[PDB]
C-alpha cells in the first residue's frame, strides 16, 4: 500500500513508502532566540514576522503527526554555558553585529543552553516521547546523535520544518539527503531572515529532479498524511 | 611584528582574526569534473565554465606561495555500494542515471573518463583529492581527518555548483569551526539566480557561513 | 620547553608538547550506575571494589590538573527518557541479565538521563567551566560533540581515566587515537568488571610501540605535570 | 523465520533475524603488512604464526558466505601515498620501533596504499561486488564510507574476522556495536601480536551479557548459516 504527498518536483516520498513507523517530523530551532523579541535574531534587526509566520502551520502539522503516531523530533541550536562547543569564529561574528552568543540579553545569555531565550517556544513545546536534539551548529547531524536516533528508529523519511529556511533547515536537509534519507520540505512551515533567500533555498531543493528531496505545504501534508 | 593578514571580503575582512598563513590555509576546488563542465558529457555549460579561468589564477598563486591545495570529485564506487536509492532514482527519472553509460563513460562513477577533474585544473603531487559520494565533502570521507592532521584552520572555496556541493561543503566546514571564504567568481551553478542567492546566504547575520570575496582581491592580498 | 611524563612504552606525550592549553583530562563514566550500589554494574553482580578503586587516584589527578588550568572533560553514558538513542540489541542484552536499561531500580531508571543512578558521583563532580559529554555508546566520540569541543579548544593531548577500562575507556582511547590525538592512560585511575580484562586493556595500549598511546599512573603524572 | 548461530554469551543474532540480505562478513586487514614476511608486523618482531592461524578458518567462512549470497566486506589499513591521512604520532611510533609507515621495505612502502605489502593476501582476495574499505585508522568506521555503505545495504548484522584481534578487529566491533549493529566475533578467525591479548579481547565481548555482541567459531557458523 503506497502513499504520496503532492509535492514539487515529484510526489513524495519517491517510493510511496510513507508510514508512521518509518517517518519523522523534525521541527528545527523554533526557539525565542530565533523568532521572539529580545533574542539573537531580534538583536540583529531582522523582521520577526518572517520567522513567526511558520508557527501556526507547524502547529497544525505537529498536531496531525502526533495524532497519527509519527516520530517527532525537535532541535535547539545552542551552546554549553562554558562555551566549549562554540567556535571562535561563530562567536566573533555574533559579537561584531551586537548579538553575541553567550552575552547577556533580555532573555538571558544569547543561544546559551538553559537560558529562557534559548528554549523552544511554548506554542511548539515538546511532549513526552519526542526527541530533542541539542546542536552546536546549523546542521542537525553535525556533532549530535541525530543519525544514531534515526537509525535505531529505522526512519527513512523526514519532513522538515522550522527556521531559518536557508541556514539550519537547508543545512539539515543537505546532511540528511547525503546520508540517503528522503526529505520533504514544507515551504509554509519555514521562514528566513530574508524572504528572497527563503524562496531561493526552496527552489534549490527542486533542481536536478529534486536534488535534496521535494517540497510541499502544511495543508497538503495534513490532508493526505496516512 | 604580528603575522596578521586579511583579504578584502563581504561582510568582513577574511579570515576573521587575520591568521592567514600557507601552513594553516587551504584552497579547495570542488567537483570541476569533465561530465559537469568539460567539452562533452553526462546543454548549458556556460555558467559552470565561467569560473575556470579565475580558479586557474587562484590555484597558480596559491601553489606559488606554498598553500595547501585540496580537490574534490563527486562519484560512486563502481559497484554502487555507496549510492543511496533515492539519489539513484532521481537521476534515472531525469535521464541522467548514475552508473548508466554516457559519452564519457558511466555517469558519476569513479574511474570513468567523464568523472575525472578537467585538465585545466588538474591536481599535482602533494594536493589531496577527496572522493565523495554526496554533495558535502565531509560526509563519508577522510577530509576532516586530513584537515586536522595538517592543522588547517582557513578554507577558501571554489568550484561547482555554488548552491549544491560548494554551499554544502561550506556549511559542513563552518559548523566544525573552519573559517571559510567563498570566491564568488570562482563558482557557478545551474541557475544564476541560485548562484547569487547561495552567495548572499553566506553574508547574512554578520557572515553566518563565513565571508565572500573574488579572485582579484584574493591574489592582490594573499601573503 | 618540552615536558614528559614517565610512561610505558614511551615518555608521553611523544613530542613533549605538554601544556595546559593543549591538554585535557577526561574522566569517563564515574556514575553510580557504573560504580555504586543499586546501579547497572551492581545489578550484574560485578565486584564494586574494582570500579571504586580508581576514585581517589582520579581525585588527585583532577585536583592537580584543575590547579594548573588544564581543560577538564567528564562523560556520562546514558539514554534519553524516551529511549530513542538506545539500540535494540543493547537494551535486550541488558534485560536478559537482569539489569535492563530504562527499567526501574533502586537508583531510578537504569542508565537513563536525569535519574539519580545515572549522575556522576559527587566525589568527582564537575565544576563550572568543565565540559560534560552525554553519550549513548561506549566510545565518547560516537554520536557526541566531543571531537568538535576538542578541536575548538585546540586539544592535542588527552589523559584518560575512569571506568570501565576495557569498555568505555579503551573504546574512547581507540577513537581518539585514530583521529590523531595523543593519549595517556592512567592505569591506577581506571577499573573494570574483571581485573584481568583491566590489565589486558592496559597491555593492549603498549604493543607495537604504543599502538594507542602510552600508559602511566596518577603519581607519575602529578609529579611531572607542568 | 528466526535462525541462530550457537554463540557465547547468547545465540546470535539476538533476535534471530539472520538473512543474506541483512548480514555481512567483514574480513579485517588480512594484508601482507599484518601477516606476511617483510611487512609492518614482521618488522616489529612479532610471531607471524599467530596472525597466520586465522587464514584457513576465514577461507572456509568466506566460501560459505559467498555461496549463500551474503554481503562480503574487506578492509585494508593504509595511507594515501602522500601521507596526508597519517597522524604524526602514528608515524613517529612506527619509526621508533623500526617499522616506519611510508618507509621502504622489502614489500614496498610500509602501510602505504598501492604497495605490494599493503594488499590483501591472495588466499582471501576480494571478488567483484565485495566492498573494500581503505582505512587510515584501526577502526573501520573512522574517516571512511563504511557506515554509509552499511546503511544503503540495510545491513544489520556483522560477522567479524581478521587481524589483529585486539586492535583493528576489536576497534571495528566496538564502533559497529555503538551504532546499533549486531556483531559476532569468530574467535578462530582472528589473531594478535600476543596470544593473551587475543584471548582477552574475545573475553571482553562476552561481559555484561554480551557488551559488544557475541562470540562463535568458523565451524559453528558454517554449520548453521541459513
Numbering used by the authors:
A (entry chain C), C (entry chain A), D (entry chain D): 8 to 233
B (entry chain B): 6 to 47, 53 to 233
What does the paper say about this structure?
BiuH is structurally and mechanistically different from the ‘canonical’ AtzE from Pseudomonas sp. strain ADP, which fulfils the same physiological role; i.e., it liberates a nitrogen atom from the triazine ring and allows further degradation to make all three nitrogen atoms bioavailable. The protein is a tetramer (consistent with SEC); each monomer adopts a five-stranded parallel β-sheet which is surrounded by α-helices. Helices α2, α4 and α5 (residues 95–102, 178–186, and 202–213, respectively) make symmetric interactions to another protomer in the tetramer, forming a dimer, as part of the basis of the quaternary structure.
Depending on the structure and the chain, the loop containing residues 44–53 is at least somewhat disordered and has a higher B-factor than most of the rest of the protein.
